[PDB]
Design a protein around this nucleic acid. Structure first.
Ligand SMILES: Nc1ncnc2c1ncn2[C@@H]1O[C@H](COP(=O)(O)OP(=O)(O)O)[C@@H](O)[C@H]1O
Ligand SMILES: Nc1ncnc2c1ncn2[C@@H]1O[C@H](COP(=O)(O)OP(=O)(O)O)[C@@H](O)[C@H]1O
Ligand code: ALF
Ligand code: ALF
Ligand SMILES: [Mg+2]
Ligand SMILES: [Mg+2]
Ligand SMILES: [Zn+2]
Ligand SMILES: [Zn+2]
Lengths: 650, 650
RNA sequence: GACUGACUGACUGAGACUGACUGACUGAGACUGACUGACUGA
RNA sequence: UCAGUCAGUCAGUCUCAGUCAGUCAGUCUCAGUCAGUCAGUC
């Protein structure tokens, strides 16, 4: 009620009010949600007595879903329209076939609608009259939005009434253009993909926009690395030693992988290790010596990979975290005794260099400096920090809570479900309206969190396509806000600069497109839709052995595996009941795990679980190598979809 | 005699008359009791001279038992058949082994039959020839009906004659179906669980049903809450203060429980308090300071819980009740002096806001409005009001009797035994045939009270599965009746709507099932019974220390506890005779209670009681913490079944 | 013949106490599967 | 075109806690009426 509609909202609403399928392109923070409110209200009130229509509203991430549902519920309570929502949260849900019919406004996540359409419970899209697509720029190759549109267009082009389509965006996306022409082509293809005739952008009331919406400012921070790293040097020495050990047993392995000049802390090295594994555990010999060599190479490569992960975490996260991870692996888990001696040799030196604060990670130093100086300048402010990986979320949480210098900070974690839950996310969000001052977020904090007060956005080695850049920068709804990209690589800065340009070129291309005459636009859109529909339509149309990946013991055969509930795999038979051994006090204790029978091979196959009445063990294809019963060939399967056999029920 | 059989009763009776085990599904109020009368009469009269058979009739709740017994007694007096009943009421009962043999019709409560079968006094079910199951929808996981059926089926499938089985219902129940298929599966499993081949529903004489039976109408009433509550605010301020006090002593209490964002008036907060208790009184220290901290945290948490209960009662019941409860706790029952000062500080403000009628609970306001307007419209009517908890029964009784505006109302309480007694329930029921006009009832008023005149049913925040919805709505036998769900939460309304749908989907699924061909139905039923029987058959196959929960004083040892009559626990020895102290004038006076010896700890352990000749004290495991005599570990036992020891007689 | 006292038993009616069972409602955790997109490397 | 990492989205199977309401088993008590039996004074 207290919200007073501004002029530019009416301007944007106009074409949709008329009743054409439209796309709205506006800068972040202008209040496109209120525009959707007004369009929905005007469209619904238009119908005559005795006839009513439905409204559908999607969202990708759960917190966005929750806040949109709350906004709609608060706005439309007074008119008496009944709204509702569906999500993964609702358990034992009433069948949707009629919860669509009972209510007026329905909020969803597109996967639900796609599921129902594929199953067929919802007959056709004609039950609806208005479809609103938030963050509409994602309508592309296989995103669920595009599958919904595929159903829509396949229905329209062949032979019932169809609903109006409205899309909202803050950046339509440029794709991979190298010139204005390809940007124009990409935008035209996008508009065709969702059957829109009009693109609406505010121009008449621009000046009003400038003092209504404050554009955030951008900054870069390059941080150099240390020339001398004791931990890096000693771990690299361990790398050289372990590599020599691995080299000595094998006849050759320089030649096995085409990769060359492998650095130590690079992902290329990790790919090399994975390739050497997948090439060596598949290597066969004419027999116990074969298993022994396989075991030795497996252990060597596993420790190599674990140390490489420790190195990358060390160069990203703080000093202590890498040693924590390594010590946990060693303690939790012959040759392995030798390697344990090797690590325990250096442990104390590693701890000593870790507790020397002079060798602290420079990135953390500069991040402390930025937070300190900002919070000195403004005592009160709400800032968001963006990372790549949840492990880094936990690491930064601990490091922030453990710094006496940053007594100001009050942390709040935020991440996608699976793991924080839905009500926890809702509470953390609502608290910011409160005693929290900093929010550590993963990728879910894009596409609109709408915190009314945010003046600082920090990117911790977080870059990508232009869409992510714009959606990250836009989070600073509060005026005077700033964004800081912190990194230790110049190429990242270059990518950021070129992405800024790409944004500019897209913004010019859309203005060029707006000049085109109507009904030629629609004609070329129809042509593109027809061509793409033709392309898609014509686009598409035993008893083997399984053995332990580490000791090559004959685990089982696919003739004895019965799938339960189409989604779990198990095997019956006393023969399998000897080939493994459980653990007396399993590490989770929260149920007993499976392990290789021979004391030589401590390899985790699967886990126990109980179906309705029966306790049974289940295995993962990630544990075995498959071997033909006729020939001696082998492959490796990482995922049951690739494996092909006689899938048999319980 | 004056009852004239209607057509649909004969239609329903037909399959049972033939002699197959059947289920009857009919809408509420159609007179299924008379159908049972006719089936029983026809079945009993069929036998030839010199041979006779028995009839058994169950019921769950005592008032239903009483009214069914009265109905059978009045009907079958003229034929000369001898009926009788058994229940928990009969004291010094003649042994049943032959009160079954002496009479023809026997009325019971299934727990009696299960008790006798487990003990073995009744040899086998073959003594009977007809078993009638009223409210048959309860035959499920562990309900006594299902155990009786388990005996029946275990006898039948393995290797004497067996009795016919008839069941009656008004709603078979849908379980947790999400589609018609799962509803059909649930109904098939239900029919299998009680070995029925035919489901009977009236279709030919439907039109007769519509003017014979009036369907009650349904309505919803959403009530908003007050934005500003003085009592809520002040009690919340006390919450914040007490929480700060509790926080200060303990090193950490945030991290002990995974629960987050605890609201004040929620059950989640109560669970948090219970978790903090069960985690803190078990916490051990290397000694008097340990007891002091335990006492302090105990008192803080106890007052927190009591205030939270006051808050929830206040938001449910009237203003005065919460203060009544709190004052009674404080008056009945160092640090406690401090907290008493804290409460007495605010007492007068609490009373002042309580006696301001403008801040009355809105739910009570709207309930007064509904009763007023109805009784204005119709001066004479009989209405029933449904609540969750007996405490609310008393509160509503007082509040209704104390309102000058509602001079019309004449109240009648009704609740299960243990506490009103059986003859009191019978008198209250018979009075409604009289000067009473409103009945306040707990859950016992479901599954059929059969008040010939009821035109108004009110639900005070009472919702559940579809069975409860249907059985609650059906109570309005009188035509023109109505049902009103009053609530202050929208999710409750949504649950009610989805339950209405679930009823519709079940009613369609049963009609689908009726189409199936005979002897395939029975075949799949036999398959289900066999599978379930196999599943059930294979499904199943010291001197420690006890100390005071509040002061950690060494109470006793399990080596000195002797159980009497297998059901009371006591301890002998002068050592225990010092560890406690009785009270001179105990609060019940009706016998002396037990309390902790030290004046620091006023904690009630148990109560005195006299066996045939000897006065002895008995204790409750609810009073102590158990500690190993060898190690320092502790657990908490809430119920003697969990505790395992050397149970020794007197 | 009628006067006052004490005892026993049988029948009721009412209360308080202690133990186990079932069901419904929540709140929170663990496990296994499939899908999409973005980034790299070759 | 292939590989490998990362992050989001859904489907399905499980469990533990805590409150609530019903159902049974067992040990007790106080009241009031009734009918018998005795002692003592007239
Ligand atoms: N009439 C109005 N006056 C002031 N603020 C408004 C008005 N309408 C909407 N807003 C603000 O706009 C915000 C929603 O913007 P949103 O559309 O989510 O941004 P974006 O365009 O980036 O998606 C809300 O936080 C609300 O405070
Ligand atoms: N022949 C009849 N004529 C009129 N009323 C009848 C007749 N037979 C039974 N009734 C009524 O049916 C009621 C019993 O219904 P009941 O079977 O308990 O309902 P429900 O089907 O919900 O269990 C009684 O109150 C009685 O008055
Ligand atoms: F649509 Al936005 F922040 F870009 F809510
Ligand atoms: F069986 Al009913 F009211 F449902 F007596
Ligand atoms: Mg938005
Ligand atoms: Mg009935
Ligand atoms: Zn192995
Ligand atoms: Zn004590």
């Amino acid at each position: 009620s207290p919200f007073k509609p501004r002029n530019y909202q009416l301007e944007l609403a106009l074409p949709a009010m008329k009743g054409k399928n439209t796309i709205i392109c506006a800068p972040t923070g202008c209040g496109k949600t209120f525009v959707s409110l007004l369009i929905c209200e005007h469209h619904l009130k238009k119908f005559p007595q005795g006839q009513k229509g439905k409204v559908v509203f999607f969202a990708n991430q759960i917190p966005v879903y929750e806040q949109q549902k709350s906004v709609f519920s608060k706005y439309f309570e007074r008119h008496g329209y009944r709204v509702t929502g569906i999500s993964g949260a609702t358990a034992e849900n009433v069948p949707v076939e009629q919860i669509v019919e009972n209510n007026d406004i329905i909020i969803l996540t597109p996967q639900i609608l796609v599921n129902n359409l594929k199953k067929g419970t919802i007959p056709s899209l004609s039950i609806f009259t208005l479809m609103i697509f938030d963050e509409c720029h994602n309508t592309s190759k296989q995103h669920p939005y595009n599958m919904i549109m595929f159903n829509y267009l396949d229905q329209k082009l062949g032979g019932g009434p169809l609903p109006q389509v409205i899309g909202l965006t803050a950046s339509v996306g440029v794709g991979d253009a190298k010139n204005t022409d390809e940007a124009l082509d990409y935008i035209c293809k996008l508009c065709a993909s969702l059957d829109a005739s009009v693109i609406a952008t505010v121009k008449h009331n621009l000046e009003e926009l400038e003092q209504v919406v404050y554009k955030p400012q951008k900054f870069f921070r390059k941080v150099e690395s240390r020339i001398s790293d004791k931990f890096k040097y000693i771990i690299a020495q361990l790398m050289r030693d372990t590599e020599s050990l691995a080299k000595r047993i094998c006849k050759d392995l320089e030649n096995l992988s085409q990769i060359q000049n492998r650095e130590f802390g690079t992902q290329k090295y990790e790919q090399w290790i994975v390739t050497v594994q997948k090439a060596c555990m598949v290597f066969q010999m004419p027999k116990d010596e074969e298993s022994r060599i396989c075991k030795a190479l497996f252990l060597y490569t596993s420790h190599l990979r674990k140390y490489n992960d420790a190195l990358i975490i060390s160069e990203h996260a703080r000093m202590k975290d890498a040693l924590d991870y390594l010590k946990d692996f060693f303690s939790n888990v012959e040759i392995e005794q030798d390697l344990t001696q090797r690590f325990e040799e250096k442990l104390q030196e590693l701890e000593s260099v870790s507790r020397d604060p002079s060798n602290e990670n420079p990135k953390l130093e500069d991040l402390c400096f930025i937070l300190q100086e900002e919070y000195h300048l403004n005592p009160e402010t709400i800032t968001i920090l963006f990372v790549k990986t949840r492990a880094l979320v936990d690491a930064l949480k601990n490091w922030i809570e453990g710094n006496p210098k940053l007594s100001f900070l009050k942390p709040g974690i935020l991440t996608g479900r699976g793991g924080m839950t839905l009500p926890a996310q809702k509470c953390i969000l609502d608290a910011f309206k409160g005693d929290h001052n900093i929010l550590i977020a993963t990728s879910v904090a894009d596409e609109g969190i709408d915190i009314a007060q945010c003046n600082l956005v920090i990117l911790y080695e977080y870059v990508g396509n232009v869409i992510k850049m714009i959606q990250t920068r836009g989070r600073g709804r509060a005026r005077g806000s700033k964004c800081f990209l912190l990194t230790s690589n110049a190429g990242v800065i270059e990518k950021e600069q070129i992405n800024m340009y790409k944004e500019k070129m897209m913004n010019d291309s859309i203005l060029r497109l707006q000049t085109w005459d109507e009904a030629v636009f629609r004609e070329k859109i129809l042509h593109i839709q027809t061509h793409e529909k033709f392309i898609r339509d014509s686009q598409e149309k035993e008893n083997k052995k399984l053995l332990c990946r580490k000791c090559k013991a004959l685990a089982c055969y696919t003739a004895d595996v019965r799938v339960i509930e189409e989604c779990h795999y198990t095997v019956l038979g006393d023969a399998f009941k000897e080939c493994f051994v459980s653990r007396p006090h399993p590490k989770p204790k929260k149920r007993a795990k499976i392990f290789c029978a021979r004391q030589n091979c401590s390899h985790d196959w699967g886990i126990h679980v109980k179906y309705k009445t029966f306790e049974i063990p289940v295995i993962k294809i990630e544990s075995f190598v498959v071997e033909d019963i006729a020939t001696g060939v082998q492959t490796l399967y990482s995922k049951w979809k690739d494996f092909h056999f006689e899938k048999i029920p319980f």
